[PDB]
Amino acid sequence: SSLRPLYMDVQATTPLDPRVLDAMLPYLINYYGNPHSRTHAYGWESEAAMERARQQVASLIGADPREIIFTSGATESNNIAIKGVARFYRSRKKHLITTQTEHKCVLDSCRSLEAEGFQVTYLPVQKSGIIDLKELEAAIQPDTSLVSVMTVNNEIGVKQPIAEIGRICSSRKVYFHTDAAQAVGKIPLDVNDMKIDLMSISGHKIYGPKGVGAIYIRRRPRVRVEALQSGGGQERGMRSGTVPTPLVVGLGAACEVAQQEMEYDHKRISKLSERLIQNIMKSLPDVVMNGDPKHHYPGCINLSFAYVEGESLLMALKDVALSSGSSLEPSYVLRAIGTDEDLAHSSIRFGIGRFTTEEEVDYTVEKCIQHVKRLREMSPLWEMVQDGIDLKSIKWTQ
Amino acid sequence: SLRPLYMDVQATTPLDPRVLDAMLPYLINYYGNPHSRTHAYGWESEAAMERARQQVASLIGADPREIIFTSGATESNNIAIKGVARFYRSRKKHLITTQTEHKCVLDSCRSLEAEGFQVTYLPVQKSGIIDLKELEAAIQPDTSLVSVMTVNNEIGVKQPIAEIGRICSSRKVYFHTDAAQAVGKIPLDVNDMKIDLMSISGHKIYGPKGVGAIYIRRRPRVRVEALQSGGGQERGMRSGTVPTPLVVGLGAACEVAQQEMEYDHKRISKLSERLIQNIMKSLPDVVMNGDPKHHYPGCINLSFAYVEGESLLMALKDVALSSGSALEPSYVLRAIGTDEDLAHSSIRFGIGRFTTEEEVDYTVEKCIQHVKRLREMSPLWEMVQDGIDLKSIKWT
Amino acid sequence: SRAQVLALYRAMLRESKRFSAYNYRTYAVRRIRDAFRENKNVKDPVEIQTLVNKAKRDLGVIRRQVHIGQLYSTDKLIIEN
Amino acid sequence: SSRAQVLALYRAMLRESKRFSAYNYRTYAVRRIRDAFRENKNVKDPVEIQTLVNKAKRDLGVIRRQVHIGQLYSTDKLIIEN
Amino acid sequence: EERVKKIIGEQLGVKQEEVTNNASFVEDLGADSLDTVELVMALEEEFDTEIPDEEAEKITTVQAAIDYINGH
Amino acid sequence: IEERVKKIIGEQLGVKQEEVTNNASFVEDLGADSLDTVELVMALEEEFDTEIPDEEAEKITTVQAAIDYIN
Amino acid sequence: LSTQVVDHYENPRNVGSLDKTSKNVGTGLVGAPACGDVMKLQIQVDEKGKIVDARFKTFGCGSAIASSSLATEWVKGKTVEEALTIKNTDIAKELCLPPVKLHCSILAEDAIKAALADYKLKQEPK
Amino acid sequence: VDHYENPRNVGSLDKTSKNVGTGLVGAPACGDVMKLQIQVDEKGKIVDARFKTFGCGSAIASSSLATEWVKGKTVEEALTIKNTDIAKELCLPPVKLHCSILAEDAIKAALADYKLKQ
């Protein structure tokens, strides 16, 4: 009994594309067979759907169908890539390279590996959020077994130079994994052009169903990986357990739709992103954009509104579903790119998706300008600066 | 072409329309991430999630806080076995399980053996049930975990779970059970059965595929090492985005099951009896695998003498069934000492919530017909019917 | 009231008969039958009202799920001639 | 030529898309149909036209089913809808 | 064409020799109200019709049902 | 009002009200293609909460045609 | 976000500032922007020692804003002695603050005390 | 596939003939047991052939087509059977190709009786 707020949080999750649901429902109603039942049609048709979906994912990323392994999500996928490569080459190589802005599942997998006696190097990013290739080159060691860098950041939408990293890891004979959860279906990906050895894919980030993902494990020059989920040997023994047919069908449908609609979606999402940022800045000073605007996915916009607290502004926007880069600690990505401590609490993340309308954008810009102005009239920092006081005024204490 | 009848409920079950009707709102409008704490799209999703957790808990007699959502009973079994084992590694390196456990349990124990653990695989008696004396005698000072499944997925035998609970409690050993085939079909009280961990699969109780749950007792806290590293969702026991539509589906399925359990058990009992009784009054040399006294009528495994499993399944182009033929024979059937020749002559009938008597009678008819025919084609049936004893001839 | 209960029985049966899926149809019909027939000798008015309310909710479910089944229908079972 | 079939189909798809309860699906569907037809207007190959038409019909079925489902499990409107 | 004597015969589980035209469903044919609702439904299935509660409630005897079908 | 057709068309085809003469055709004078006219007839159906069968809808090619149909 | 924490937020009482150069105004500027919350609370004291006016400006979440707004609201017509007895716990209870949001009440109280200390520090001889 | 539940020459001959060959190859522990019987003409040609096999549908088909092919051939033309021809003729995958081997093992075994029965 109340109007719902606008959804502007696409990086956290996306709605089902009605085409995807229409693809799934038959397997939620009549085709409920187990894809591993080899002795009857209920199984044959289900398996058929599954392999078809596998082909769809493969076509979206330029891989062979045999290289796609179905998982529960990009989290499991990242665990499989990192822990799989790490555990497999343990007897001979115990060093990994990743970055400080990677998703928490990558970082925490690396954490547990450190607990098991592995050596991890977390590459720092530049102020722009992009890594320094020279540092990656200098970091690789003889016993380096894996290099993991994410394609698109989920907090500031920065695009890492995936191809160049592929070159380096190839010429240095080191496995390359990438967490493409925020890039699949939004920007082009060719595993061969980018010389990628493992890739993580999340279904519910591309308007597919929740609880299903995929991991690409290159087979061309075979990449070896130790499986984590023990069982009956499903998914080439890389992921035992019953393959959830409706979910994988959904994933395939989402990847096919994305393959078709990518250019269109990117054109109009680019337009909307420009509209939002341009309009907000032409009306509010001291709003900085986190992330190099040259290498950036326009769907994810992180803005720091000077002198206004994140939670307060989010609460003033009770009509727009937003986020502020998350627990009870500050954003580690914003600290990694060296954002001033004071501004770490003054950033929010607008997500412009496939279904976002121009009305939604202009509305969010309205409430944003209005409430940033109001909260600035209430802010003691805005008063101190506008009154000539320098933020280096050690009158701080607790 | 007309579709065949479904008799393979142990492999998977269709969605109960109530479960789908419960899910769709979260597949359409309530697409919020349950971990988005800053807007309504997340709050409503989380609410649905906790509601489902309470539903599962009520079905198994547990506290809501003790339920952890997983991707399926496979992940649950990995979490229980490898989690418990890895956590108490510093002091206990022995595990006890049985030879009829599901392959995910057996293979988890295998990998643990690769990690330096010792596993004891109890044999089952000819009836498929374990010997409690053998289980007590198996426990060692460094035994950390005992894993026994509630109901077998191949022969539907019921293990004496409560007594195992007593034994493991009095010996201070954690008790885990893979109840994937028992939830919603027979009663389960985690406190009465003194259970420390339990695996639950959604798509075995008419819930959606790709979702499961694990019960980890908190009363005498059981510590478990998490396998999936991440942001700390599910109390750090199972990182990753909780798939709300799936968990909602699972909760609805568990509540529906809690309501319909008695009814389903009555009518499934009637149907199972009808099937077995009718089949045996028409075909000689038809053996039922599993102690008929401690057996869940939903899973019936029968050995049809002198007929190969695959051939019979193929003659039943009208009924979706399963067997345990060969690229290896059923290890459950070998564990109960089934005659080697008969290991290839067994099939598995599953009578579910929606199975109709018509379906049963059809399966009985086609089954008798094609077993008779294939017996006319069988050289073994000729050898026995022609007075030669199959326990003597030279093979190969 | 008795009238509401009877009309409800009629509605639930007639709507269940419209399931495309053979299993869903048979189960729905039989379950409604056994359910009503089982709660026939209930005198408690509060229990009667509760049962009726649950029956209404399940009727809504039956409608929606029947429509869904019709939108995504498939071929029949060998058993249906 | 194929003008009649294409136009009648355009009408069916727009009119049906307008029945989405959810704001996002409705707006997206309408705008997408518009942009699509307007972009594939200058196609002369009749085989390419027939391909586009067949895909458009399948998408019509999808739209019907999904609108009906959306109505069955509908929710409240957005603050933007007044 | 009172093949109704079959429907009722199968519906209430009573031999056709019992279906007297002047026999009431509850008194004579020993059926409860649920049985009778299922009965009108079944008749609708056979003769492919639709009896609103207004005129359906009246159907209490064989002659009533046969007469209704003949009309309508 | 009633000639509020002049509003619909005006906003639908994006043309000043001074151009929506009763004797103005959608395609020739108001410069619209057939797709635009499909959207237009639809818009009329939405405004006046009516339903124009395809038979008589094809006839609607001029402002006076629409006004005549609604009345 | 309790109902009251809603009303004091974007419906706030006494948002502004007084003249820090008054000998009758007390300014407490407590907090730190790296930690998230920064409260500036000012008061005006009567010849008879009553607080006649009071304003605030805080940088922080809606709960901290509520704590500060309610703070100035309460400190209005009380003496400098009667003000020192605010007790953050009373603020929290009056606003229904969960555990993770309890720091705000502390900051508010530390503000009141700080400002009173400024005023009392301006009244001393030379 | 076509030969299963559509079999050619399913049966048995009289093992007491001095002109009929009975070959019973296989084993029930391994899964497949093929019994192939043949009748030899005065001119050394195969006159009839029947079979009875215990195994999957692939072994059954291999046996039906087996007897069908061993029908009108000379004792010499049978020794050149080669299971591979069976595999190609039925398009059997690797895991089910073993049946062809058993099929071959059957033909020779029957011949082994014939040459041993003469």
Ligand SMILES: *P(=O)(O)OCC(C)(C)[C@@H](O)C(=O)NCCC(=O)NCCSC(=O)CCCCCCCCCCC
């Ligand atoms: P009549 O001859 O007058 O008989 C008297 C009757 C029974 C009609 C009535 O007066 C009476 O005696 N009532 C006593 C109690 C009662 O009326 N109970 C009615 C409600 S009980 C009920 O229907 C339970 C709910 C059934 C739900 C069906 C679930 C199926 C779900 C399928 C989903 C796929």
Ligand SMILES: *P(=O)(O)OCC(C)(C)[C@@H](O)C(=O)NCCC(=O)NCCSC(=O)CCCCCCCCCCC
């Ligand atoms: P008018 O000026 O009289 O003429 C109209 C037409 C276009 C018929 C005529 O001008 C013409 O150009 N004819 C030749 C070209 C032609 O036939 N084009 C047909 C294009 S068919 C098409 O584009 C199908 C695209 C389907 C997109 C649907 C989007 C699905 C959205 C689903 C949301 C969930």
Ligand SMILES: *Cc1c(COP(=O)(O)O)cnc(C)c1O
């Ligand atoms: C959202 C997200 C995930 C989570 O994927 P799941 O399928 O929910 O497990 C993983 N990685 C990244 C970068 C994500 O943005």
Ligand SMILES: *Cc1c(COP(=O)(O)O)cnc(C)c1O
């Ligand atoms: C079916 C089954 C499983 C599979 O559960 P998933 O969700 O597919 O992993 C696990 N254990 C048992 C005993 C099962 O019967």
